[PDB]
């Protein structure tokens, strides 16, 4: 897989959705990216695993915790991602 850093320009709505978190026992993953939106402009993609949100490790975050941190992020929103390249 490939490590990437994305700065998403603000303000929110950022134009994406996430799934997973510690309370779901799964990594935080981008599920939907709005066809027209900030996340799409920044080349955030469905399936991208969020490794960090504004420098903060995402692994131990609850789902609602990751959501809130994204929703309330300063501009730009900084995401560190792990992009799976395998089919
Ligand atoms: Cl891979
Ligand atoms: Cl990087």
PDB file of N, CA, C and O in Angstrom, residues 15-53:
ATOM      1  N   UNK A  15     -16.908  17.019   1.913  1.00  0.00           N
ATOM      2  CA  UNK A  15     -17.414  16.249   0.775  1.00  0.00           C
ATOM      3  C   UNK A  15     -16.974  14.798   0.755  1.00  0.00           C
ATOM      4  O   UNK A  15     -16.667  14.259  -0.308  1.00  0.00           O
ATOM      5  N   UNK A  16     -16.923  14.171   1.931  1.00  0.00           N
ATOM      6  CA  UNK A  16     -16.688  12.724   2.018  1.00  0.00           C
ATOM      7  C   UNK A  16     -17.361  12.084   3.231  1.00  0.00           C
ATOM      8  O   UNK A  16     -17.861  12.777   4.117  1.00  0.00           O
ATOM      9  N   UNK A  17     -17.388  10.757   3.246  1.00  0.00           N
ATOM     10  CA  UNK A  17     -17.928  10.004   4.361  1.00  0.00           C
ATOM     11  C   UNK A  17     -16.890   8.976   4.824  1.00  0.00           C
ATOM     12  O   UNK A  17     -16.030   8.549   4.037  1.00  0.00           O
ATOM     13  N   UNK A  18     -16.971   8.589   6.094  1.00  0.00           N
ATOM     14  CA  UNK A  18     -16.098   7.563   6.664  1.00  0.00           C
ATOM     15  C   UNK A  18     -16.845   6.426   7.359  1.00  0.00           C
ATOM     16  O   UNK A  18     -18.022   6.548   7.731  1.00  0.00           O
ATOM     17  N   UNK A  19     -16.134   5.315   7.519  1.00  0.00           N
ATOM     18  CA  UNK A  19     -16.629   4.150   8.234  1.00  0.00           C
ATOM     19  C   UNK A  19     -15.522   3.671   9.168  1.00  0.00           C
ATOM     20  O   UNK A  19     -14.349   4.025   8.983  1.00  0.00           O
ATOM     21  N   UNK A  20     -15.902   2.891  10.171  1.00  0.00           N
ATOM     22  CA  UNK A  20     -14.954   2.204  11.024  1.00  0.00           C
ATOM     23  C   UNK A  20     -14.526   3.015  12.228  1.00  0.00           C
ATOM     24  O   UNK A  20     -15.080   4.081  12.512  1.00  0.00           O
ATOM     25  N   UNK A  21     -13.532   2.500  12.934  1.00  0.00           N
ATOM     26  CA  UNK A  21     -13.099   3.075  14.198  1.00  0.00           C
ATOM     27  C   UNK A  21     -12.938   1.964  15.216  1.00  0.00           C
ATOM     28  O   UNK A  21     -13.308   0.819  14.961  1.00  0.00           O
ATOM     29  N   UNK A  22     -12.375   2.309  16.367  1.00  0.00           N
ATOM     30  CA  UNK A  22     -12.093   1.352  17.434  1.00  0.00           C
ATOM     31  C   UNK A  22     -13.347   0.593  17.907  1.00  0.00           C
ATOM     32  O   UNK A  22     -13.305  -0.627  18.096  1.00  0.00           O
ATOM     33  N   UNK A  23     -14.458   1.311  18.063  1.00  0.00           N
ATOM     34  CA  UNK A  23     -15.732   0.701  18.486  1.00  0.00           C
ATOM     35  C   UNK A  23     -16.400  -0.179  17.412  1.00  0.00           C
ATOM     36  O   UNK A  23     -17.391  -0.857  17.682  1.00  0.00           O
ATOM     37  N   UNK A  24     -15.843  -0.164  16.203  1.00  0.00           N
ATOM     38  CA  UNK A  24     -16.289  -1.040  15.121  1.00  0.00           C
ATOM     39  C   UNK A  24     -15.208  -2.076  14.790  1.00  0.00           C
ATOM     40  O   UNK A  24     -15.368  -2.891  13.876  1.00  0.00           O
ATOM     41  N   UNK A  25     -14.109  -2.028  15.545  1.00  0.00           N
ATOM     42  CA  UNK A  25     -12.940  -2.907  15.360  1.00  0.00           C
ATOM     43  C   UNK A  25     -12.416  -2.969  13.910  1.00  0.00           C
ATOM     44  O   UNK A  25     -12.004  -4.029  13.429  1.00  0.00           O
ATOM     45  N   UNK A  26     -12.442  -1.825  13.228  1.00  0.00           N
ATOM     46  CA  UNK A  26     -11.970  -1.710  11.846  1.00  0.00           C
ATOM     47  C   UNK A  26     -11.230  -0.376  11.655  1.00  0.00           C
ATOM     48  O   UNK A  26     -11.486   0.586  12.388  1.00  0.00           O
ATOM     49  N   UNK A  27     -10.291  -0.312  10.684  1.00  0.00           N
ATOM     50  CA  UNK A  27      -9.643   0.970  10.426  1.00  0.00           C
ATOM     51  C   UNK A  27     -10.648   1.990   9.910  1.00  0.00           C
ATOM     52  O   UNK A  27     -11.678   1.616   9.331  1.00  0.00           O
ATOM     53  N   UNK A  28     -10.351   3.261  10.132  1.00  0.00           N
ATOM     54  CA  UNK A  28     -11.148   4.350   9.578  1.00  0.00           C
ATOM     55  C   UNK A  28     -10.877   4.426   8.083  1.00  0.00           C
ATOM     56  O   UNK A  28      -9.722   4.542   7.651  1.00  0.00           O
ATOM     57  N   UNK A  29     -11.949   4.345   7.306  1.00  0.00           N
ATOM     58  CA  UNK A  29     -11.855   4.264   5.860  1.00  0.00           C
ATOM     59  C   UNK A  29     -12.841   5.214   5.191  1.00  0.00           C
ATOM     60  O   UNK A  29     -13.995   5.336   5.615  1.00  0.00           O
ATOM     61  N   UNK A  30     -12.373   5.881   4.140  1.00  0.00           N
ATOM     62  CA  UNK A  30     -13.225   6.714   3.286  1.00  0.00           C
ATOM     63  C   UNK A  30     -14.149   5.805   2.473  1.00  0.00           C
ATOM     64  O   UNK A  30     -13.693   4.868   1.820  1.00  0.00           O
ATOM     65  N   UNK A  31     -15.450   6.081   2.522  1.00  0.00           N
ATOM     66  CA  UNK A  31     -16.431   5.261   1.812  1.00  0.00           C
ATOM     67  C   UNK A  31     -17.032   5.956   0.595  1.00  0.00           C
ATOM     68  O   UNK A  31     -17.242   5.324  -0.446  1.00  0.00           O
ATOM     69  N   UNK A  32     -17.352   7.235   0.741  1.00  0.00           N
ATOM     70  CA  UNK A  32     -17.968   7.999  -0.337  1.00  0.00           C
ATOM     71  C   UNK A  32     -17.184   9.290  -0.504  1.00  0.00           C
ATOM     72  O   UNK A  32     -16.761   9.898   0.483  1.00  0.00           O
ATOM     73  N   UNK A  33     -16.977   9.703  -1.747  1.00  0.00           N
ATOM     74  CA  UNK A  33     -16.432  11.034  -2.004  1.00  0.00           C
ATOM     75  C   UNK A  33     -17.373  11.761  -2.957  1.00  0.00           C
ATOM     76  O   UNK A  33     -17.623  11.284  -4.068  1.00  0.00           O
ATOM     77  N   UNK A  34     -17.904  12.901  -2.512  1.00  0.00           N
ATOM     78  CA  UNK A  34     -18.862  13.675  -3.310  1.00  0.00           C
ATOM     79  C   UNK A  34     -18.254  14.055  -4.657  1.00  0.00           C
ATOM     80  O   UNK A  34     -17.098  14.494  -4.716  1.00  0.00           O
ATOM     81  N   UNK A  35     -19.025  13.867  -5.728  1.00  0.00           N
ATOM     82  CA  UNK A  35     -18.535  14.096  -7.096  1.00  0.00           C
ATOM     83  C   UNK A  35     -17.979  15.505  -7.276  1.00  0.00           C
ATOM     84  O   UNK A  35     -16.913  15.685  -7.866  1.00  0.00           O
ATOM     85  N   UNK A  36     -18.708  16.492  -6.761  1.00  0.00           N
ATOM     86  CA  UNK A  36     -18.212  17.855  -6.660  1.00  0.00           C
ATOM     87  C   UNK A  36     -18.009  18.193  -5.186  1.00  0.00           C
ATOM     88  O   UNK A  36     -18.971  18.270  -4.415  1.00  0.00           O
ATOM     89  N   UNK A  37     -16.754  18.360  -4.785  1.00  0.00           N
ATOM     90  CA  UNK A  37     -16.445  18.731  -3.411  1.00  0.00           C
ATOM     91  C   UNK A  37     -14.960  18.881  -3.160  1.00  0.00           C
ATOM     92  O   UNK A  37     -14.143  18.584  -4.039  1.00  0.00           O
ATOM     93  N   UNK A  38     -14.625  19.349  -1.959  1.00  0.00           N
ATOM     94  CA  UNK A  38     -13.240  19.606  -1.557  1.00  0.00           C
ATOM     95  C   UNK A  38     -12.393  18.330  -1.530  1.00  0.00           C
ATOM     96  O   UNK A  38     -11.250  18.344  -1.986  1.00  0.00           O
ATOM     97  N   UNK A  39     -12.960  17.235  -1.017  1.00  0.00           N
ATOM     98  CA  UNK A  39     -12.224  15.964  -0.943  1.00  0.00           C
ATOM     99  C   UNK A  39     -11.887  15.445  -2.338  1.00  0.00           C
ATOM    100  O   UNK A  39     -10.779  14.961  -2.572  1.00  0.00           O
ATOM    101  N   UNK A  40     -12.832  15.571  -3.269  1.00  0.00           N
ATOM    102  CA  UNK A  40     -12.589  15.141  -4.643  1.00  0.00           C
ATOM    103  C   UNK A  40     -11.500  15.986  -5.317  1.00  0.00           C
ATOM    104  O   UNK A  40     -10.646  15.437  -6.020  1.00  0.00           O
ATOM    105  N   UNK A  41     -11.523  17.301  -5.079  1.00  0.00           N
ATOM    106  CA  UNK A  41     -10.475  18.221  -5.558  1.00  0.00           C
ATOM    107  C   UNK A  41      -9.070  17.791  -5.099  1.00  0.00           C
ATOM    108  O   UNK A  41      -8.104  17.917  -5.857  1.00  0.00           O
ATOM    109  N   UNK A  42      -8.992  17.289  -3.865  1.00  0.00           N
ATOM    110  CA  UNK A  42      -7.744  16.881  -3.200  1.00  0.00           C
ATOM    111  C   UNK A  42      -7.334  15.446  -3.516  1.00  0.00           C
ATOM    112  O   UNK A  42      -6.300  14.972  -3.036  1.00  0.00           O
ATOM    113  N   UNK A  43      -8.139  14.767  -4.334  1.00  0.00           N
ATOM    114  CA  UNK A  43      -7.924  13.364  -4.714  1.00  0.00           C
ATOM    115  C   UNK A  43      -7.950  12.388  -3.522  1.00  0.00           C
ATOM    116  O   UNK A  43      -7.188  11.417  -3.477  1.00  0.00           O
ATOM    117  N   UNK A  44      -8.837  12.655  -2.564  1.00  0.00           N
ATOM    118  CA  UNK A  44      -9.229  11.649  -1.577  1.00  0.00           C
ATOM    119  C   UNK A  44     -10.125  10.641  -2.305  1.00  0.00           C
ATOM    120  O   UNK A  44     -10.965  11.029  -3.114  1.00  0.00           O
ATOM    121  N   UNK A  45      -9.922   9.355  -2.036  1.00  0.00           N
ATOM    122  CA  UNK A  45     -10.624   8.289  -2.770  1.00  0.00           C
ATOM    123  C   UNK A  45     -11.341   7.311  -1.860  1.00  0.00           C
ATOM    124  O   UNK A  45     -10.841   7.002  -0.779  1.00  0.00           O
ATOM    125  N   UNK A  46     -12.507   6.788  -2.306  1.00  0.00           N
ATOM    126  CA  UNK A  46     -13.147   5.684  -1.589  1.00  0.00           C
ATOM    127  C   UNK A  46     -12.147   4.548  -1.366  1.00  0.00           C
ATOM    128  O   UNK A  46     -11.383   4.207  -2.279  1.00  0.00           O
ATOM    129  N   UNK A  47     -12.145   3.982  -0.165  1.00  0.00           N
ATOM    130  CA  UNK A  47     -11.211   2.913   0.167  1.00  0.00           C
ATOM    131  C   UNK A  47      -9.923   3.356   0.854  1.00  0.00           C
ATOM    132  O   UNK A  47      -9.236   2.526   1.466  1.00  0.00           O
ATOM    133  N   UNK A  48      -9.581   4.645   0.746  1.00  0.00           N
ATOM    134  CA  UNK A  48      -8.396   5.195   1.423  1.00  0.00           C
ATOM    135  C   UNK A  48      -8.569   4.993   2.921  1.00  0.00           C
ATOM    136  O   UNK A  48      -9.651   5.253   3.473  1.00  0.00           O
ATOM    137  N   UNK A  49      -7.532   4.481   3.564  1.00  0.00           N
ATOM    138  CA  UNK A  49      -7.541   4.332   5.016  1.00  0.00           C
ATOM    139  C   UNK A  49      -6.946   5.588   5.647  1.00  0.00           C
ATOM    140  O   UNK A  49      -5.827   6.008   5.318  1.00  0.00           O
ATOM    141  N   UNK A  50      -7.696   6.188   6.560  1.00  0.00           N
ATOM    142  CA  UNK A  50      -7.206   7.350   7.299  1.00  0.00           C
ATOM    143  C   UNK A  50      -6.322   6.891   8.473  1.00  0.00           C
ATOM    144  O   UNK A  50      -6.808   6.280   9.436  1.00  0.00           O
ATOM    145  N   UNK A  51      -5.026   7.188   8.362  1.00  0.00           N
ATOM    146  CA  UNK A  51      -4.014   6.830   9.367  1.00  0.00           C
ATOM    147  C   UNK A  51      -3.862   7.932  10.426  1.00  0.00           C
ATOM    148  O   UNK A  51      -3.607   7.648  11.601  1.00  0.00           O
ATOM    149  N   UNK A  52      -4.031   9.185  10.007  1.00  0.00           N
ATOM    150  CA  UNK A  52      -3.948  10.331  10.923  1.00  0.00           C
ATOM    151  C   UNK A  52      -4.849  11.473  10.460  1.00  0.00           C
ATOM    152  O   UNK A  52      -5.072  11.669   9.254  1.00  0.00           O
ATOM    153  N   UNK A  53      -5.380  12.199  11.439  1.00  0.00           N
ATOM    154  CA  UNK A  53      -6.201  13.396  11.203  1.00  0.00           C
ATOM    155  C   UNK A  53      -5.498  14.536  11.932  1.00  0.00           C
ATOM    156  O   UNK A  53      -5.405  14.517  13.170  1.00  0.00           O
TER     157      UNK A  53
END
